Design a protein around this ligand. Sequence first.
Ligand SMILES: CCc1nc(CN2CCN(C(=O)c3[nH]c(C)c(C(C)=O)c3CC)CC2)no1
Length: 102
Amino acid sequence: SDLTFCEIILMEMESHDAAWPFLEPVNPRLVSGYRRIIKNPMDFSTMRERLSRGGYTSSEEFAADALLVFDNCQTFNEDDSEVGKAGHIMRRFFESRWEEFY
Ligand SMILES: CCc1nc(CN2CCN(C(=O)c3[nH]c(C)c(C(C)=O)c3CC)CC2)no1
């Protein structure tokens, strides 16, 4: 039931207009400095893979992955960059859907 909500939240996030930086993993070989700064990478397709095989035992574990996506994005990207702008927008969206459910 809680994970039921997580499926919907993930679909809406995947379908959001500001989702474009977060649909596939950052390839550390293609981004200078990414591996040295981000130890716990996360993205929506990785969350989708885990959710599909029942790898989230609680909604809390889903929320940890979602915030990793946005925390990694704020750590590595400036607020003024297109990717930075997108992470701030998706965090507010996630925080809005998460609070009108949990
Ligand atoms: C640019 C080289 C590269 N392409 C990809 C694949 N795919 C990853 C996500 N993506 C982004 O634009 C994106 N999303 C985030 C969270 C970031 C960073 C650095 O935080 C970035 C910069 C590449 C689209 C492309 N991997 O490396």
